Every structure is written in structure tokens, then in C-alpha cells.
Design a binder for these strands. Structure first.
Ligand SMILES: [Zn+2]
Ligand SMILES: [Zn+2]
Length: 58
DNA sequence: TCCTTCGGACATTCAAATCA
DNA sequence: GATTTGAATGTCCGAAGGAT
């Protein structure tokens, strides 16, 4: 029954953290961009459209 | 040793589907 | 209308190999 627990996620990951698959944080610039001395950039998330059927549930 | 890369486990998003 | 479902979507651990 290995379902490991994680610490709270960053609310949103900046572009560099998304690309690196590394942990972001909630301040801007994030810690990883502070360390790299690079610009910390937020990108838009995909928004689910309405009208897409799923089929019956259980 | 530090840094970069990344497969896939852990977690979130939210309209559809279902309930009441 | 209110609550539940669950695939799409998002986050980032931990391992491997490269860089310094
Ligand atoms: Zn970040
Ligand atoms: Zn950043």
C-alpha cells in the first residue's frame, strides 16, 4: 500500500519549474529562479471548455 | 559534489453526471 | 439546485548521467 505523501504543492509553478519538473513556491521570483538568477514567468493554464461529454459514471 | 533532465507517482481542476 | 465523479491537467520526487 505505497501511496507516499507530499508536502503542499505550490499553488502555481513558474515556467522554469514546469520545464525542469522542480518544486516552485508561492513568492515571485521563486527560489529556483532566484538561485539561477533568471526571470520568473507565470504561464496560463488550460481551461476546460463546456460541452464535452464524458459518458455515464459508476 | 552540483546541475540538468525526465518517467511517472502524487495531486488538483471542475463541467459532466448524478442525486435529491 | 446541490453533491459526486473521474479524465484532463498540473506539480515535482527521486534516479541517472553530465558538468565543474
Ligand atoms: Zn518556480
Ligand atoms: Zn520561477
Amino acid at each position: 500500500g505505497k501511496v507516499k505523501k507530499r508536502l503542499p504543492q505550490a499553488k502555481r509553478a513558474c515556467a522554469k519549474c514546469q520545464k525542469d519538473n522542480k518544486k516552485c513556491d508561492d513568492a515571485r521570483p521563486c527560489q529556483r529562479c532566484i538561485k539561477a538568477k533568471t526571470d520568473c514567468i507565470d504561464l496560463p493554464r488550460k481551461k476546460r471548455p463546456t460541452g464535452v461529454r464524458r459518458g455515464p459514471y459508476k
